[PDB]
Amino acid sequence: TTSAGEGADPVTTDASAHGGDTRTTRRAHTDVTFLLDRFTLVGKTNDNKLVLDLLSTKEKSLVGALLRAATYYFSDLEVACVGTNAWVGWTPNGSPVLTEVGDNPVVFSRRGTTRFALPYTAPHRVLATVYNGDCKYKPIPTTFNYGMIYTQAEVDVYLRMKRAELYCPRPVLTHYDHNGRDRYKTTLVKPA
Amino acid sequence: TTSAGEGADPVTTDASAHGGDTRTTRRAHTDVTFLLDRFTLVGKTNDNKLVLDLLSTKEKSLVGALLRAATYYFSDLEVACVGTNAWVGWTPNGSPVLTEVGDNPVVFSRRGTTRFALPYTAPHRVLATVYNGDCKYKPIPTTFNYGMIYTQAEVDVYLRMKRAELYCPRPVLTHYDHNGRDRYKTTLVKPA
Amino acid sequence: RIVTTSHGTTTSTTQSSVGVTYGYALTDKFLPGPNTNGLETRVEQAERFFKHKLFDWTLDQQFGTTYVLELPTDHKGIYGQLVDSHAYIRNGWDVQVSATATQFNGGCLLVAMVPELCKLDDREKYQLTLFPHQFLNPRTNTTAHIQVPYLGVDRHDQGTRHKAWTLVVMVLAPYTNDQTIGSTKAEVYVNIAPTNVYVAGEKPVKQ
Amino acid sequence: SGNTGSIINNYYMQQYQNSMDTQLGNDWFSKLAQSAFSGLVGALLA
Amino acid sequence: SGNTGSIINNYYMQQYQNSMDTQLGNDWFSKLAQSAFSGLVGALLA
Amino acid sequence: GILPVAVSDGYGGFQNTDPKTSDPVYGHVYNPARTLYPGRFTNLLDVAEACPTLLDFNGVPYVQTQSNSGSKVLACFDLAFGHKNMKNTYMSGLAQYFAQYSGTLNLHFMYTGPTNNKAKYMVAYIPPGTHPLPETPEMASHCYHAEWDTGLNSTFTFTVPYFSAADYAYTYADEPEQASVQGWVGVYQITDTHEKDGAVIVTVSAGPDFEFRMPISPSRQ
Amino acid sequence: GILPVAVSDGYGGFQNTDPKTSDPVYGHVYNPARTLYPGRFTNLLDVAEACPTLLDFNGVPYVQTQSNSGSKVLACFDLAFGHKNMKNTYMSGLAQYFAQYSGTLNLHFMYTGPTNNKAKYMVAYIPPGTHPLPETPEMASHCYHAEWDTGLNSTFTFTVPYFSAADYAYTYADEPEQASVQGWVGVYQITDTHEKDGAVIVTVSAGPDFEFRMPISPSRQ
């Protein structure tokens, strides 16, 4: 179909012009909520502390990449610290940094991992993955966090976004290197 | 609004005088019962004994502070002794101090902690956090307790007030030190 | 394709319209929130067009060349006065961008409104189309028109600093003047108007 | 009430879980707060 | 919704499991997609 | 056979703020009647709305005409619970236990002068980013404000509003925070008959729509 | 007595993609209203259908008449997300996270030449195993194709079909894969008035029946 592309109005076509059909599609796997609803490893704690910042997610992982594909987002959160450690503790967004959690929410370990559920605690209606605040581009606020955890020992930290909502899509780039080759190619799983 | 403040009758005003609204408020977090319904660490046992006295609560902790914000109170109680120890035992308010619990309620440890539930056992309708009994001020009775615990070894003791009722509010002072500064300031949780 | 947009005492008539692109919403409905305590007010007098020259589209600029204009920009009119009198402000934008070239010139500019644009890689440029946009293609039109709503993690902004929106015009195909009668460059102008401006928190102007 | 919320329930009977309250024969501060004057003393203009 | 599916249920109350949403007083892209032109500009033959 | 069950890692550890009850151990205890016991309170904010507490101005709860200075400013302070003037108030006392708040506040002014001493005052809410904080009634009149004079009624109550980009503000101040993110409140004396002081007792209480969220035990040093 | 229960081996370990929720620990938090927030998206394919992204032809998004060569081929590339021309597209971006796909694709061509410069183009889908990939419009006319000429409408949209032995194809290419298992798409220029280039911007979007399955985090190096 010819069209006046300048106006930017969407155009989506079948194969019917050429005599074709349309297959039945089931897009369950491209559902945003479903996609982000899994645990992603963000790394290890530091002095047995870790600020819960979704921007800590590895940017080439499925979750890190998708989260960054949106300008704004909202979600609740689940945490799981795996490692040999006794107890993970937590403080909400806006609390002063402490020397010891003592009395704030504390959860004891069970068979080497501590997993628990948290609520969105920011003071904003939604958070952003980018924020052009005083950083004049020429050709992230304190508040953007989900609290902080305190642990008894070093552990691997995993975050899981629950009830996720994304707004204003942003680019998602391929991360494999073509080298000089035209096609990309790798070894895919095959019977040995 | 002008008023005859001398009479002490309450006055609470909107922003309507200046053209304003009123926001919808949800005071779930300032609910007394909810607030005190959590475990607070009061310390370690002594000769493997500890009198259950809510006044043992750390006075600068959320629970210790709030409990002291009332003259009278009532509640049931939950206890959790964490540490490597085999068994925590208990006797009600008014029982003689014993050499061994033997036969009074005993509860065995499970994965390093022993947690159990108790009933208010005092002989009074309510207890007090202060009691001006023979202590003439110039410009706590035996009975005020929840019993006593006996343990097999030293442990950290946690108390949790259940079904809490508070009467006759008392002052709650700030505990941070301004130093000489005008504002107070600390480091709040922020993305690193 | 004659369309006249008007705001206040200002009008704009184009004869090569290609339509308006509404970004992320069909309207900028204002829902007052608790952050203003109901003291915010609309100032319609501010909702009018102001103009700016963005750049000269020339023969040497190649694909990827990018010019941006962060909003809110400096304003020497009513809108700018709001900033001195009030602490908080919010509004959307009605944007018209033009590149006046002859139909005997060639090339193509991409015009887009991107939110929270702190930085842009060169690869990300291939995907600028995920943002509300339109095209300036000489053979077809000399006008672009995008209308976007107020956006942000906060219901209001504390006077500038934060530029929620940044207009971006980038060369897709280079300008050409291979047919003798075209022009050697095309000036690119911007015609913008703030919409639904609500301000709050009055303070003294001057001293 | 309080900070306990199990959609399901409680396994042991009430007489064991808690102490039983009794009566003989009421939120002062809520009432006190409710009673505060929130109007305007004097006459208003414009 | 999401990647959670227990035919049975959830044990703790909603006010504890998640944060409660509020309102004052909607899938842009679905709508945008829905609106795409999928016809034919001009006349068709044969 | 019997019910197959899967024990899950990460679940079960001791928790201090968990939503479940402990197993009972001592039954059948009936309490003494506490029917009609007076002074009961249910929410800290009910007492916080009804009972204003004293501000501190370098050791005293009152603001005053004062000595030498052609300065009409009786007090100007950061709208912050951590400000030193708010130091001994029930509101700041409570606020140390919550991370965020939202809502209005009420400031009360009780005049203490003799019958023949008359004055006229004004209080304004200065928003953040305002530059030279106004030092004169004249300049301050450009802000949300209230002017009142002395007379039969000794007390005047003012409503400090809530403006911010966000729906909630923090009760604490981050170390790197040069100016008050919430602005200031300035109390000025426009005029006074007699330079011999007339003390104005200042007090603060929660507004009808004030609210705290996120309990925290900020404990220690 | 009490409920007999059998604890099962192999069940219970920590899982990263499991269908259950963690135990709660901090209740009663009510969020700020996010009513009417703009730009919401629910499925990556809705944005993928509506927003075409740029192909890359050695550094530029356009195909062109070009210099020396009596070659009518403007572009001919493997129908593959891993092809270098597809490198910077949202479709290839997303595809790296799924193992398989099925469905149609839309290729768009926007002509950029001046009013007096006219041309006529053609695009064809060349199935796998086709031998000498056609280099001329004449030969390529034997494939599923579309011819169009310049005029009032600058843009033309083409539908790349789905043919394969299987219902789904792989987004990645196995190391031992000499030819494109999915064939190629060839874009040719039948004729042009003026040899001074007229740039055609090429773009790609998901077809109405396109679909991805099997999310994968292909992470690293």
Instruction: Walk across the sheet containing A89-91 and list its strands.
Output: A49-51, A148-150, A89-91
Task: Quickly list H helices, chain A.
Answer: 32-36, 62-67
Q: How far apart are CA A106 and CA F17, in angstroms?
A: 7
Q: Which residues in E lie closer than 8 A to residue F19 (C-beta atoms)?
A: 12-13, 16
With CA atoms as reference, report the closest residue to B126 among F17, A83, F32, F36.
F32
User: Which of helix, strand or coil describes residue E20?
Assistant: strand
- CATH number for the domain spanning F114: value is 2.60.120.20
Max CA separation in chain A (angstroms): 71
Q: With contact defined as beta carbons under 8 Å apart, do A143 and A51 qualify? A: no
Helix H or strand E segment including G93? helix G90-95
Distance in angstroms (rounded) separating the CA atoms of residues F189 and F200: 10
> Which chains are within 8 Å of G by 3+ CB pairs?
A, B, C, E, F
Option in G17, G33, G43 nearest E22 (CB): G33
Calculate ∠ Cα B20-B25-B27, nearest 5°.
Answer: 145
CB atoms within 10 A of CB G45: 24
**CB distance C173 to C63 below 8 Å:** yes
Tokens, residue F53: 């507490």
Pair B138, B132: CB distance under 8 Å: no
Q: Give the sign of the dihedral formed by CA F94, CA F99, CA F103, CA F108.
A: positive
Tokens of B44: 């370690």
Can you read off the two tokens belonging to residue A187?
């070894």
Q: What domains does chain B contain, in order, with CATH numbers?
A: 1-192 (2.60.120.20)
Q: Is F148 within 8 Å of B2 (Cβ atoms)?
A: yes
CA nearest neighbour of G104 among A21, E17, B158, B187:
A21
**Chain F contact set for G32 (CB, 8 A):** 166-168
Number of compact structural domains in chain G: 1
Sequence-distant (6+) residues with CB within 8 A of G172 are A184, A185, A186, A188, G81, G82, G99
> With contact defined as beta carbons under 8 Å apart, do C164 and C152 qualify?
yes
> What is the Cα C190 distance to its own chain's centre?
7
Query: Alpha-carbon dihedral of residues A53, A58, A59, A65, nearest 10 degrees?
Result: -90
Neighbours of A118 (CB within 10 A): 26
Q: With an 8 Å Cβ cutoff, are F108 and B11 in contact?
A: yes
Cα–Cα separations (whole angstroms), residue G200 to C18, C29, C199, F162, G94: 19, 39, 46, 56, 25
Cis peptide before G208 (omega within 30 of 0): no
Side chain identity, residue G196 = K
Q: How far apart are CA C200 and CA C24, in angstroms?
A: 26
Which range of residues forms the domain containing residue F53? Answer: 1-221
Q: Which residues contact F123 (CB under 8 A, 6 or more apart)?
A: F107, F109, F145, F146, F158, F185, F186, F187, F188
Query: How far from chain centre, in Å, is Cα B87?
Result: 25
Quote the tokens at residue F107.
């400031």
Task: Return the ∠ at Cα C81 (arms to C76 and C86), rounded to 5°.
Answer: 150
Give the integer Cα–Cα distance in Å for F146 and F187: 10
* Separation between Cα atoms, residue C120 and residue A135, nearest integer Å: 13
Cα–Cα distance, E7 to E18 (Å, whole number): 19
- What span, in angstroms and rounded, lies between the C-alpha atoms of F97 and A54? 26
C-alpha atoms less than 13 angstroms from C-alpha of F188 in its C-beta half-sphere: 25
- Total beta-carbon pairs less than 8 A apart between chain D and chain F: 75
Q: Do residues B31 and F43 touch, judged by C-beta distance below 8 A? A: yes
Q: β-strands G169-170, C41-42: how paired?
A: unpaired
Residue B9: which residues within 8 A CB-CB, separation 6 or more?
Answer: B3, D35, D36, D37
Using DSSP bridges, classify how beta strands F119-126 and G211-215 pair: parallel, antiparallel or unpaired: unpaired
B110: which residues sit within 8 A by CB, 6+ positions away?
A: none
User: Which residue in chain G is spatially nearest to E11 when comparing CA positions?
Assistant: G23
The answer to whether B41 contacts A102, with C-beta atoms less than 8 Å apart, is yes
Provide the strand spans (E) within A26-171. 39-44, 49-51, 70-82, 89-91, 113-118, 127-128, 148-150, 156-169
Burial call G185-211: b when 16+ CB within 10 Å, e when fewer:
bbbbbbebeeeebbbbbbbbbbbbbbb
Interface size E-G, in CB pairs within 8 Å, comes to: 75
Asked if G208 contacts G104 with a C-beta cutoff of 8 angstroms, the reply is yes
Exposure of F140 in the CB half-sphere (CA atoms within 13 A): 26
Chain D residues with CB-CB distance to B17 below 8 A:
40
How far apart are the two ends of chain C, measured CA to CA in Å? 51
Shortest distance between the Cα of C82 and any Cα of chain E, in A, equals 26
Cα dist. C2→B17, C5, C189, F89 in Å?
50, 10, 19, 66
Which chain F residues are within 8 Å of A94, Cβ to Cβ?
99-100, 170-172, 214
3-state secondary structure of C108: strand
Domain ranges of chain E: 1-46
Name the token pair of G31: 């969020």
CA distances from B118 to B92, D21, G185 (A): 9, 14, 77
In words, the CATH class of domain D1-46 is few secondary structures
Q: Please give the helix or strand (H or E) that residue G137 lies within, else none.
A: helix G137-140
- Residue C4 pairs in a beta bridge with C13
Asked if F208 contacts F49 with a C-beta cutoff of 8 angstroms, the reply is yes
Please give the span between the terminal C-alpha atoms of chain F, in angstroms, as a whole number: 58
- Residue C123 burial (CB < 10 Å; 0-12/13-18/19+)? middle
CB contacts < 8 Å between B and F, how many? 248
What type of residue sits at position C113? M
Joined tokens for residue G212: 């991805």
Nearest to C66 by CA among C119, C142, C145, C22: C119
Q: Going by DSSP bridges, is the β-strand pair F62-63/F144-149 parallel, antiparallel, or unpaired? A: unpaired
Burial C181-204, CB ≥16 within 10 A → b, else e: ebeebbebebbbbbbbbbbbbbbb
Structure-determination approach: X-ray
DSSP summary character for residue A4: -
Q: For residue G71, which of G188, G184, G185, G200 has the smallest C-alpha distance?
A: G188
- List of chain G residues whose C-beta atoms are within 8 Å of the C-beta of residue F19: 24, 27
- Facing residue for C104 by CB, picked from G32, G116, G196: G116
- F216: tokens are 């925290």
CA–CA gap between residue G19 and residue F39 (Å, rounded): 49
Resolution in A: 3.0
CA atoms of C91 and C174, how far apart (whole Å)? 34
CB atoms within 10 A of CB F195: 9
Pairing of strands F3-5, G5-7: parallel
- Side-chain-side CA neighbours of residue G156 (13 Å): 18
Identify the residue whose tokens are 């301004």. B178
User: What does DSSP assign to residue A11?
Assistant: B
**Residues F144, F122 contacting (CB under 8 angstroms):** no
Please give the Cα distance from F185 to F105 (Å, whole number). Answer: 11
Q: Domain of C46: which CATH number?
A: 2.60.120.20
* Domain count of the fold of chain C: 1
A45-82 burial, b if ≥16 CB within 10 A, otherwise e? beebbbbbbbbbbbebbbbbbbbbbbbbbbbbbbbbbb
CA dist., res. C193 & res. F62, Å (int): 51
Cβ atoms of residues D5 and F18 within 8 Å = no
User: Is there a contact between G206 and G136 (Cβ–Cβ < 8 Å)?
Assistant: no
Q: Virtual CA dihedral for B63, B64, B67, B68, nearest 10 degrees?
A: -150
Rounded Cα gap, residues G111 and G155, in angstroms: 6
Neighbours of chain B (3+ CB pairs under 8 A): A, C, D, F, G
Name residue B44's amino acid. Answer: K
Half-sphere CA count of C76, side-chain side, radius 13 A: 2
DSSP codes of every residue in A97-117 = P-S--TTS-BB--BTTEEEEE
- The C-alpha of F66 sits at a distance from chain C's nearest C-alpha, in angstroms, of 26
Distance separating alpha carbons of residues C125 and A171, to the nearest angstrom: 9
Whether G108 and G127 have beta carbons less than 8 Å apart is answered as: no
Among residues A166, A89, A99, the alpha carbon closest in space to that of A127 is found at A166
> What residue in F sits closest to G7 (Cα-Cα)?
F5
Domain that holds residue C20: 1-207
Q: Which of E3, E10, E15, E29 to mutate to test the interface with A (most CBs of A within 10 A)?
A: E3
Q: C201: which strand partners? A: none
The per-residue DSSP string of chain F comes to --EEE-PPTB----BSS-S-PPPB-S---BPPP-TT-TTEE-BHHHHHHH--EE--BTTBSEE---SS----EEEEEES-TTSTTSTT-HHHHHHTTEEEEES-EEEEEEE---TT--EEEEEEEEPTT-SS---SHHHHTTSEEEEEE-SS--EEEEEE----SSS-EESS-BSS--S-TT-EEEEEEEEESSSS---EEEEEEE-TT-EEEEE------
How many Å apart are CA F74 and CA F63, to the nearest integer?
6
- Chain F's closest residue to E13, CA to CA, is F19
Structure token pair of residue C34: 């608790």
Interatomic CA distance for residues B41 and G172, integer angstroms:
56
Instruction: Establish if B86 touches chain C: CB-CB under 8 angstroms.
Output: no
